Design a protein around this ligand. Structure first.
Ligand SMILES: NC(=O)c1ccc[n+]([C@@H]2O[C@H](COP(=O)([O-])OP(=O)(O)OC[C@H]3O[C@@H](n4cnc5c(N)ncnc54)[C@H](OP(=O)(O)O)[C@@H]3O)[C@@H](O)[C@H]2O)c1
Ligand SMILES: NC(=O)c1ccc[n+]([C@@H]2O[C@H](COP(=O)([O-])OP(=O)(O)OC[C@H]3O[C@@H](n4cnc5c(N)ncnc54)[C@H](OP(=O)(O)O)[C@@H]3O)[C@@H](O)[C@H]2O)c1
Lengths: 431, 427
């Protein structure tokens, strides 16, 4: 006696369309892998029409009725908005329905209330598709690395910003021309703000940090800096220093001198040495680096955006949720046991690349050096040359120090007389 | 209530496992929901010079796996028959089992999985494939809603360290293998590695996990690196390639719709621009191609006591979580019953290095031999030796045709000897 498992898909856009196509075209495999048939009950949408690749009788705009049906077992939330999403997720869990979602912004703001609700109803809540599109990242960090100690999660989690920077690195194009080409070729949107400013990265970083270090981290905890201040000159200096530039999401388990642990989650442009694995990740692809104590360095690479790869991840969650209902017993449980404090950006040890225009006098380098040393910052590399009998281009790369000390050093350099301007400031990671 | 652990086996993996159970007790207990307590360590030679408290050591494996205060049995013994025996007894006693045995999983999963499903109990084996790289769980759970078509890459740390050394230093196979054994990257009898048994067992497991069918080691074509020379790497560099021990697992589809599976491990010239060409040292890398997901790559350490212990502990936490929360893992799904495609049917390319007569006619003879079996040549290089060296690279063609041509070449009068024959993948 194998009772079918009902599925309600909310959304028929880029991801939902692919999810429904798979539930259709792979029904035999899916059923065989779940143990019972996987039967689509209805599709939540706003526009109901016969021109949506599905029979209209499946389409509905009443989402609350669709997730409330008794012959529905799993609810797949693939609508954009967060308030409709949360309302659907909650009403569905309350009725004992397993939930699969891909909603970055909802998960990055509070998995606490939703996870508690799924635990109460004794049902699953899977959101693998929320981070890294098709790249399995959440399940490896919650299950495969559960017996280990993760210390660093870092990688490229935004395809648009990686395509733009990869393009600036290859062609020497200016940011504006690279963004234009990106928009034209369909890699960026009419308003790419969520990408180029780093909001998409910050949300994903909050989720990754929470999963990796067993603490609650929200998008509001993540320091955010985008790529709009990255220039072609920056890439030229980076190349001269053996680096490229990438928009990194970094999640670190930090330890202070007094021994207490904390968690950092931050996104910003970073000079990355060409030898680093992330430097070879180009185009719109994503890659996630995980440092653990017993396992060492792991890297997961693939497509972290798109209807088809995201659907792959959704369907993996769906099959697991259906399997759990067939055999009884849920999947993992929320592990936020650590209650680690959040380290702000100023406490984080990092390195600064600083590019300035300075007077072409033999004492200026001593002046800037003192400004770094007076705050206990050591200099690793310096490059100085003239511009065309007027001034000099002074590049400085520091050793590691707190972002606070380096931020204050920069402010100081700006106020110096010999410093005409501080043209660029970019952190440096990898090394 | 506590969860009892029994580690069968010590050494590289078992030592790290025990050390982690002790040093990470607080985190492990708080991630499981109940304390994780080591009950005993199975071993053959019981003594006090094994870096672990002696009271824990015991040579009666059957007693250890049958204890009531045990709950998970971590099998980390070498041989397959004592492993199968202990696994079965532990499962029949209602104990979840975590193993890392490649040879046991690659020869027979049927009886073991059935015994575990009957006793409503887990049988995890992530540590069997790719050391620390999580590969089995992604293919069994994350990609379960997808259709995987190809799984391939570097899955042996020892062979990969030897070849990488041969590529960096120009060393001969014997010297590199000695460096590896001396530095601890290989072992006293590296036969399991250098001849391909390790890779072929892992490939059997990968194919069966990815294509939802039963694939055993007896179905995997196996060729090692013992015949890879420094002169091979010199040619490969000249041809814009390196050499790597590749495992490949493909879902093949015919014109009529018949599906089949091919699983094969062998040496291969790979272009330097290929991603696998950058996987050096003892690292591994697994590439998965699926219909929705597209292409994925998993990179990490594939050999080592601590990396493999990491995978083992991942499975132990999950098996302990399940026993606390009353559940299980994904049932074994080998429903496709796909037939096995032999090697002759697989399209590939050959690099063939020969010593031939130093006369201007030999090239036409070798070419006709290739052509009469409908094989186009992509590149040739010919020069003289000092008291003629002929290198040929073919286009794609079936392994069977290429084998027939090689035989024909060896039997040719103008061909003094076939010195090296290596496939070429990637491209
Ligand atoms: N696209 C990607 O590459 C990607 C990657 C990772 C994660 N995700 C996440 O996946 C989710 C879906 O993205 P998508 O690209 O599929 O979005 P989409 O293309 O904009 O489609 C959204 C779908 O949801 C429906 N919908 C929206 N608001 C609704 C509401 N209030 N009530 C009922 N139905 C509603 C829409 O119906 P109508 O067509 O009638 O308006 C449409 O079918 C989002 O949370 C996104 O963050 C997407
Ligand atoms: N080593 C690696 O890097 C690695 C990586 C991935 C997977 N693996 C897998 O992990 C497993 C263990 O490998 P390993 O390198 O840890 O091996 P190992 O160094 O050779 O240790 C084997 C252990 O098993 C015990 N043992 C052997 N035969 C036994 C028997 N009949 N009854 C009871 N105990 C027995 C031995 O005890 P005594 O010392 O008293 O003889 C020893 O402690 C293998 O299945 C291997 O394929 C290993």
């Amino acid at each position: 006696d194998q009772k079918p498992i009902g599925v309600a898909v909310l959304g028929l856009g880029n991801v939902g369309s692919e999810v429904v196509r798979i539930i259709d075209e792979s029904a035999t495999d899916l059923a065989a892998r779940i143990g019972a048939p996987l039967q689509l009950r209805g599709i939540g949408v706003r526009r109901v029409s016969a021109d949506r690749g599905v029979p209209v009788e499946l389409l509905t705009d009443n989402i609350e009725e669709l997730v409330s049906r008794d012959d529905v077992d799993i609810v797949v939330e693939l609508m954009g908005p967060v308030e409709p999403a949360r309302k659907a997720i909650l009403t569905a869990l309350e009725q004992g329905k397993s939930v699969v979602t891909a909603n970055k912004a909802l998960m990055s703001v509070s998995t606490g209330e939703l996870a508690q609700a799924a635990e109460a109803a004794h049902v699953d809540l899977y959101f693998e598709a929320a981070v890294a599109g098709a790249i399995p990242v959440i399940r490896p960090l919650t299950q495969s690395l559960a017996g280990d100690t993760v210390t660093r999660v870092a990688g490229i989690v935004n395809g648009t910003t990686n395509y733009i920077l990869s393009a600036m690195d290859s062609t020497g194009a200016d940011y504006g021309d690279a963004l234009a080409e990106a928009s034209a070729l369909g890699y960026a949107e009419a308003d790419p703000t969520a990408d180029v400013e780093g909001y998409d990265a910050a949300a994903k970083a909050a989720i990754l940090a929470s999963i990796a270090f067993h603490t609650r981290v929200t998008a509001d905890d993540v320091y955010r800096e985008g790529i709009t201040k990255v220039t072609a000159a920056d890439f030229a200096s980076a190349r001269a220093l053996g680096c490229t530039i990438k928009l990194l999401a970094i999640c670190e388990r930090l330890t202070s001198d007094d021994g207490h642990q904390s968690v950092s989650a931050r996104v910003y442009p970073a000079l990355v040495p060409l030898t680093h694995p992330l430097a070879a990740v180009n185009g719109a692809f994503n890659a996630v680096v995980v440092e653990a104590e017993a396992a060492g360095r792991l890297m997961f690479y693939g497509q972290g955006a798109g209807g088809a790869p995201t659907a792959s991840a959704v369907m993996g969650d769906v099959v697991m949720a259906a399997r759990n209902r067939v055999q009884g017993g849920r999947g993992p449980r929320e592990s936020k046991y650590a209650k680690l404090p959040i380290s702000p950006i100023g406490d984080i040890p990092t390195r600064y690349y600083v590019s300035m225009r300075v007077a072409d006098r033999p004492g200026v380098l001593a002046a800037v050096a003192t400004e770094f040393g007076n705050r206990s910052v050591s200099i690793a590399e310096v490059r100085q040359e003239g511009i065309d009998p007027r001034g000099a281009r002074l590049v400085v790369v520091t050793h590691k120090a707190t972002d606070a000390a380096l931020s204050e050093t920069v402010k100081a350099l700006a106020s110096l007389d010999v410093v005409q301007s501080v043209d660029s400031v970019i952190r440096m990671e990898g090394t």
